[PDB]
Amino acid sequence: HNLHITEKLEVLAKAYSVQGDKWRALGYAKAINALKSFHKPVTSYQEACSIPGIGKRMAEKIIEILESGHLRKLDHISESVPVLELFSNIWGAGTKTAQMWYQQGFRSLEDIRSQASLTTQQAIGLKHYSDFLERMPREEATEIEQTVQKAAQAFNSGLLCVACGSYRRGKATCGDVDVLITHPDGGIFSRLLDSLRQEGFLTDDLVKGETKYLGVCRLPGPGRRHRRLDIIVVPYSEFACALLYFTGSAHFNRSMRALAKTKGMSLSEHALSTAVVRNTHGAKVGPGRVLPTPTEKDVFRLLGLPYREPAERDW
DNA sequence: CGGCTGTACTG
DNA sequence: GCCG
DNA sequence: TACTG
DNA sequence: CAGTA
Ligand SMILES: Nc1ncnc2c1ncn2[C@H]1C[C@H](O)[C@@H](COP(=O)(O)CP(=O)(O)OP(=O)(O)O)O1
Numbered sequence: 001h002n003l004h005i006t007e008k009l010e011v012l013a014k015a016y017s018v019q020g021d022k023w024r025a026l027g028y029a030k031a032i033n034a035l036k037s038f039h040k041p042v043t044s045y046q047e048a049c050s051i052p053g054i055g056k057r058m059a060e061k062i063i064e065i066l067e068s069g070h071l072r073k074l075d076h077i078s079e080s081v082p083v084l085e086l087f088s089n090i091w092g093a094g095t096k097t098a099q100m101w102y103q104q105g106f107r108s109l110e111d112i113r114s115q116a117s118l119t120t121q122q123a124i125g126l127k128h129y130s131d132f133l134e135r136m137p138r139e140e141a142t143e144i145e146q147t148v149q150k151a152a153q154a155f156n157s158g159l160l161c162v163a164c165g166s167y168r169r170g171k172a173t174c175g176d177v178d179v180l181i182t183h184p185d186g187g188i189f190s191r192l193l194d195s196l197r198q199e200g201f202l203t204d205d206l207v208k209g210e211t212k213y214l215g216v217c218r219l220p221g222p223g224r225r226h227r228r229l230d231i232i233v234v235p236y237s238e239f240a241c242a243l244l245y246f247t248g249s250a251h252f253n254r255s256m257r258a259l260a261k262t263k264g265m266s267l268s269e270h271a272l273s274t275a276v277v278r279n280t281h282g283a284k285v286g287p288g289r290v291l292p293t294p295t296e297k298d299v300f301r302l303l304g305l306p307y308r309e310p311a312e313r314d315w
Numbered sequence: 316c317g318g319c320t321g322t323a324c325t326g
Numbered sequence: 327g328c329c330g
Numbered sequence: 331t332a333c334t335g
Numbered sequence: 336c337a338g339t340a
């Protein structure tokens with residue numbers, strides 16, 4: 001962690017991101033990670049250009065920060081940016097929505113609350129604005145997972161319940177709880193949610209689909225905060241690909257999916273497929289065929305990769 | 316030049 | 327923004 | 331119980 | 336969270 005040139009660069013990345021330049025923001029993201037994991041502080045332009053993810057433009061910015069301790073770009077960042085960031089931290093509102101609100105003269109959450117027309121998701125996002133920005137301690141994630149497990153167990157179906165996401169990767173704090181539920185390959189979802197809602201445990205629903213639920217829960221007692229809860233239900237046949245997907249991290253999933261693509265394969269939460277047919281844009285023409293993947297290890301093996309424990313997937 | 320993951324949900 |  | 335899928 | 340040992 002030997003490079004606080006990244007603190008200035010992170011400012012630019014978020015600015016680009018909220019203003020909608022997604023790929024330039026991606027470029028900075030990668031450059032920032034590269035510098036974060038570099039063993040030593042970077043003193044050199046040729047040393048800088050040695051790092052994958054750091055090109056001439058990035059290198060020029062490294063040299064400028066070393067020379068002046070400042071970044072000329074940061075000073076010229078649009079004054080709309082802090083407001084765009086405030087708005088896009090509302091769950092359900094992204095860059096397009098934040099920009100529209102800003103164009104329309106909104107400047108604070110008070111403005112949004114009184115004059116803005118919110119979708120149902122954004123209204124819930126706004127009501128829990130601060131809570132959605134907080135991470136919980138690992139132990140509280142445990143209690144939430146166990147609450148879902150007990151509800152699932154009570155149906156005496158074949159339900160298996162596993163906590164994924166950052167929890168399964170062993171993190172000390174969690175932004176939400178991501179729970180995977182599997183049923184024998186042979187309405188279960190809706191009954192379960194009804195159980196959790198009857199207990200007073202589920203307090204708001206953001207998304208309810210056939211495959212995924214995203215919502216808000218709160219444990220009993222004083223000093224409790226509303227916490228985000230994601231639940232996915234998949235057939236047992238898809239277990240390993242679903243566990244791999246939901247375990248992440250997002251960056252890890254993207255790298256592994258990118259590798260699969262170079263191999264003429266495709267990886268999603270449903271399956272690993274081979275002999276996939278893609279056009280000149282890398283867009284899928286035809287689906288190829290599904291490879292058997294009984295465990296996570298099989299996916300790595302079929303990709304020609306060494307296994308990584310969830311702890312080693314946090315990227 | 317042009318990709319940078321691949322899916323689900325909403326209205 | 328970077329890189330193939 | 332400690333771990334996998 | 337059911338199964339494995
Ligand atoms: N953009 C993306 N592309 C592909 N896969 C993605 C993804 N975003 C999330 N995922 C997958 C992996 C996450 O670990 C998992 C949960 O996504 P998440 O939004 O809960 C982030 P997590 O890794 O759990 O950390 P935390 O902040 O919640 O504590 O879903």
Ligand SMILES: [Cl-]
Pocket residue numbers: 245268269270321322
């Ligand atoms: Cl997916």
Ligand SMILES: [Mg+2]
Pocket residue numbers: 165166175176177178
């Ligand atoms: Mg999570």
Ligand SMILES: [Mn+2]
Pocket residue numbers: 165176177178230
């Ligand atoms: Mn989540």
Ligand code: NA
Pocket residue numbers: 048049050051052053054055
């Ligand atoms: Na480089």
Ligand code: NA
Pocket residue numbers: 087088089090091092093094
């Ligand atoms: Na948002």
